[PDB]
Amino acid sequence: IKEMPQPKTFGELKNLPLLNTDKPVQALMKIADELGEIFKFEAPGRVTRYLSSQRLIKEACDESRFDKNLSQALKFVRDFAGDGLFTSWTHEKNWKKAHNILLPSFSQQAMKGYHAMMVDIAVQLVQKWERLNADEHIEVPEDMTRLTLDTIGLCGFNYRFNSFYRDQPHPFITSMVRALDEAMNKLQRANPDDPAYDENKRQFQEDIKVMNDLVDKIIADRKASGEQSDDLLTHMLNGKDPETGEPLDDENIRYQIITFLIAGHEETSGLLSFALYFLVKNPHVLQKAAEEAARVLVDPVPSYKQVKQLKYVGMVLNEALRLWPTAPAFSLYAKEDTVLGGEYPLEKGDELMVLIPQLHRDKTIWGDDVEEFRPERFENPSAIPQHAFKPFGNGQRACIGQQFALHEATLVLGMMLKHFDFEDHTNYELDIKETLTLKPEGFVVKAKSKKIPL
Amino acid sequence: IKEMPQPKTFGELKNLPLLNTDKPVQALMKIADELGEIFKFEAPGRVTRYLSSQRLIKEACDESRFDKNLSQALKFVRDFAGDGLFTSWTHEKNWKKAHNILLPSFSQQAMKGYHAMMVDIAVQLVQKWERLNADEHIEVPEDMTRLTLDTIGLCGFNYRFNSFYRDQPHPFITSMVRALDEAMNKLQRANPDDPAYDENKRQFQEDIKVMNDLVDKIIADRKASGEQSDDLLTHMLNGKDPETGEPLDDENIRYQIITFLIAGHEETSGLLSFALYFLVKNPHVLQKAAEEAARVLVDPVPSYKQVKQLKYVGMVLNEALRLWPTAPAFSLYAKEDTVLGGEYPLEKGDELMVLIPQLHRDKTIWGDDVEEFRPERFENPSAIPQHAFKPFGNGQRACIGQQFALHEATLVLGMMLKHFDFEDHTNYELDIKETLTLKPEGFVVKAKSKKIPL
Ligand code: HEM
Ligand code: HEM
Structure with a gap:
């Protein structure tokens, strides 16, 4: 039985001011590097324990002992993502209901049906x-x-944001980005009741209304027209949960749609951005990936089956997720009083946070070369120990969109590598911006076309 | 679309008399040197196409298109190795079950637990x-x-063959060697049912009985005693497949044990033997390796972590596997009608052989200096083209023992290089003996002790 380390404190604010940064996950990573595989993090009225080792995270990932917790971040996101899958408690009726309805819509098999829209x-x-x-x-x-x-947008509800026709975001996206920003900013505030925050609060309500109005309109438009499409919305309007026999209500559908839009905007773009960064920094890897794309993608546009053959491209993506998992943390709570790691007593309800970038840097698992970008680590997926690699979370609360995300990312990176050579013309210095996700801020490249027609 | 070449035929025996040699792999390598990257090889009732270029092998290694085939050799080995992992088809229930159960026992993590027994x-x-x-x-x-x-034997099932206490093999080994010899010799026989071979068959049955008797006794003895070792047998007796929830039965365990014993006797000993051959033939490389061993192995016996630090020794082993891969071929079948290399049409079920020593001599990959022993080729795995280097086979049917073999060989070669200087006193001329594996027959050296304690 051991006492847990704790980072530096700030009197009555305890550890809370350590989150007063643009880069809180990176700060927490540095704390982990200093304090080791577990540390206590206290804010007024809450305690969290940050886990960094596979030894401890493997136990936390035991679903008979620990369940998904809504971190303070997710509780704020729940103000606009509601009881969608991501911001739902496992024990809420609408979690299991939506999970049972949507799970077939996100299978590897369901990707055959989204593929054409992804290619568009x-x-x-x-x-x-x-x-x-x-x-x-x-x-x-x-x-x-x-x-x-x-x-x-297209695969989710047959809506075109037409982002390539625009400098600045679609108005809906302006509101979503600002709502996510407010959610994340609220985490740092010592007195969130201060009237200095009244304008932030009003803007937050406005942004929620903008989001709900577009999504609610689309749902209503779809029901009125009766049109049937290859999108998640059709599947949600027609779907019935085999357990309750119930369909999702229109409010729940709206929350799922908002949730999917956040995942597309945030984590998926991050993965692609980091994958291109590692490629231009590791030209042997870029050559090997480009060779595969060239030999596999022989047609003007990729088929579903061809995307599945891009093994090395998938390895690149996994190795990007290893170093910079774009959803960097997930939270758990103890279902009962228990002892973690033979050493750390927990009370029922105690919160754990898995710090995925640190898990992915556990030298006990990965070797001493943890900071090197080496996709060949993933050559033989059989080789990866259990609970060592968790960029999509854990168990029944893992990412429902994992197949979608990897299919999209594989297809896109494949096409990028087929059609262009890339140059890191600025010798870009990695600067990671934090929102809900992580992204390489300011990353720029030049592309030289290989002149291969579509 | 092209006709593929074929070596010389013998009327109705087709190409089969070309294997009537005690060095068939070396014969096939010379045939590849004459005919190029692919050739058809026919015997009465079977056809297989031998591939030698990375260009075609990179396609053959596509698991969506090709699966592991039991060559005629593996089919004969299956008479004593059963539906163990090596001689199973991917679609047999026992392949996936055993694979799932045994993967954690063969991980880089599990090697920490075998290390002490390897050191012994x-x-x-x-x-x-x-x-x-x-x-x-x-x-x-x-x-x-x-x-x-x-x-x-020790790491697998806590059994000491005590080979260092014997000139003549342990009786089990006598039988296993003679069963492997029978299996390989049967390949060359035009009429296997000639009574000329009835003595061979009776001996083969007696040798299988000897092998089964020891291994079934060891399993029975372990079950009776109830004892709990750090060995594969313990993990196989207590392990359950996550998928089916079932344990291995005792028969299957016995096949796995026999399989592991074969791999240790054959391929792993070939690797260490060729590594020492190359080192004494390349004294600058020997010196660089010896310097690394001296710098790293600072304790009377190596630790697990010190072995992981022997990076150049690892490269030496990879460069030995490049020139003389001790499992020199593996076989594949086409899962569907398909075209190989844009040129060679294949029907569902058609067989391919990957001729690994020739793949490893492809000058388009390795350059002009392909016959030189240069460990530095392996400094960067990302600089090696995809599917260029396949000494441990391919995909989900790759060698499960790879981490074991490389840990053992790195350990032993490290300790050899630390403790002794070596002399090629006879100016040994390489003469490669073929069994299941390749070994340098008659290779002798003199060692001069550095007089460093254990
Ligand atoms: C590379 C991209 C992605 C990453 C790295 C990622 C990561 C994650 C992680 C770690 C979780 C677990 C969160 C937790 O335990 O709190 C999760 C859940 C989820 N993700 Fe993703 N995700 C990605 C893309 C997507 C996409 C594209 C979608 C949908 C179109 C999606 C939808 C979801 C949903 C709905 C959940 C909640 C599932 C549940 O608990 O039932 N994700 N994601
Ligand atoms: C103690 C050492 C070893 C053990 C226990 C071992 C075990 C095995 C096993 C069980 C398989 C079948 C895996 C499956 O299909 O699920 C296999 C395949 C293989 N092993 Fe090993 N092995 C060892 C050492 C080696 C060495 C040193 C080499 C080569 C230098 C090697 C080359 C291979 C190859 C090429 C295959 C693929 C066979 C094919 O596709 O038919 N093995 N090994």
Whole structure:
């Protein structure tokens, strides 16, 4: 039985001011590097324990002992994502109901049905880059975010955000980004009741209304027309939970749609942006990936089956997720009093946070070369020990969108590698911006077209 | 679309008399040198196409298109190795079950637990060499086989073959060697049902009985005693497949044990033998390796972490596997009608053989200096083209023992290089003996002790 370390405190604010940064996950990573596999983090009225080792995280991932917790961040996101899958407690009726309805809509098999819509947006991206002038560059996370948001709009509810037709965001996205920003900013405030925050609060309510109005309108429009499409919305309007026999109500559908849009905008674009960063920094890898894309993607546009053959491209994506998991943390609570790791007593209800970037850097698992970008670590997926690699979370509360995200990312990276050579013309210095997700802020490249027609 | 070449035929026996040699792999390598990257090889009732270029092998390694085939050789080995992992089809229930149960036992993590038992045998080898008198030499494949067999016996099922205490093999080994010899010789026989071979069949049955008797007794004895070891047998007796929830039955366990014993006796001893051959033939490389061993192995016996630090020794082992892969071929079948390399049409079920020593000599990958021994080729795995280097096979049917073999070989080669200087006193001319594996027959060296304690 041992006492847990704790980072530096600030009197009555305890550890809370350590989150007063633009880069809180990176701060927590540095604390983990200093304090080790577990540390206590206290704010007024709450305690969290941050886990960094596979030894401890493997136990936390035992679903008979620990369940998903809504972290303070998720509780704030729940003000606009409601009881959608991501911001639901496992024990809420609407979690299991929506899970049972949507799970078939997100299978590997269901991706055959989304593939054409994914290709539509991917073609838009390739065409944009083909149309750049010689003196121009690509704003990577900006174009990746255009792609990933539009893809989930089209596949999700047959709505075109038309992000490649715009400098600034669609108004809906302006409101979503600002709502996510407020949710994340609230985490740092010592007195959130201060009237200095009244304008933030009003703007938050306005942004929620904008989001709800577009989504609610689309749902109502779809029901009135009776049209049947290949999108998640059709599946949600027709679906019945085999357990309750109930369909999702229109309010719940709206929350799911908002949830999917957030995942597309945030984590998926991050993955792509980091994958391109690691490629341009590791030209042997980029050559190997480009060779695969060239030999596999023999047709003007990729088929579903061809995307499945892009093994090395998938390895690149996994190794990007290892170093910079774009959903960097998830929270758990103890279902009963218990002891973690033979050493750390927990009371029922105690909160754990899994710090995924640190798990992915556990030298006990990965070796001493943890900071190196080496996709060949993933050559033989059989080799990865259990609960060592968790970029999509854990168990029944793992990411429902994992197949969608990897299919999209594999397809897009494949097409990018087929159609262009890339140059890190600025020798970009990695600068990671934190929202809900992580992204390489300011990352720019030049593309030289290989002149291969679509 | 092209006709593929074929070597010389013998009327109705087709190509089969080309295998009527005690060095068939070397014969097939010369055929590849003459005919190029693919050739058809026909025997009465079977056709297989031998591939030698990375260009075609990178396609053959696509698991969506090709699966592991039991070559005629593996079909004969299956008479004593059963539906163990090596001689199973991917679609047999027992393949996936055993695979799921045994993967954690063969992980890089599990090697921490075998390390002490590997050290035990490695110290026996070092001590034997320390005890030679001035005018004596080392019989290299003989001693390496003593070591590798004993290591898997001890780590596999807490059984000591005590090979360092014997000139003549343990009776179990006599039988296993003679069963492997029968299996391989049967390949060359045009009329296997000639009574000329009835003595061979009776001996084959007696040898299988000898092998089964020891292994079934060991399993029974372990179950009776109830004892709990750090060995594969313990994990196989207590393990349950996560998928089916079932344990392995005793028959299957016995096949797994027999399989592991074969791999230790054969391929692993070949690797160490060729590694020492290359080192004594390349004294600058030997020196660089010896310097690394001296810098890293600072304790009387190596720790697990010190072995992981022997990076150049690992590269030496990879460069030995490049030139003389001790499992020199594996077989695949086409899961569907398909076209290989845009040129060679295949029907569902058609067989391919990957001729690994020829793949590893592809000058388009390795460059002009392909016959040179240069460990530095392996400094960066990302610089190696996809599917260029396949000594442990491919995909989900790759060698489960790879981490074991490389840990053992790195350990032993490290300790050899720390404790002794080596002399190629006879200017040995490489003569490769073929069984299931390749070994340098008659390879002898003299060792001069550095007089460093254990
Ligand atoms: C690379 C991209 C993605 C990453 C890294 C990622 C990561 C995660 C993680 C870690 C969780 C677990 C959260 C927790 O335990 O609190 C999760 C849940 C979820 N993700 Fe993703 N995600 C990605 C893309 C997506 C996409 C594209 C969608 C939908 C279109 C999606 C929908 C969801 C949903 C609905 C859940 C909640 C599932 C449940 O608990 O029932 N995600 N995601
Ligand atoms: C103690 C050492 C070893 C053990 C216990 C071992 C075990 C095995 C097993 C059980 C398989 C079948 C895996 C499956 O299909 O699920 C296998 C395949 C293989 N092993 Fe090993 N092995 C060892 C050492 C080696 C070495 C040193 C080499 C080569 C230098 C090697 C080369 C291979 C190859 C090429 C295959 C694939 C066979 C094919 O596709 O038909 N093995 N090994």
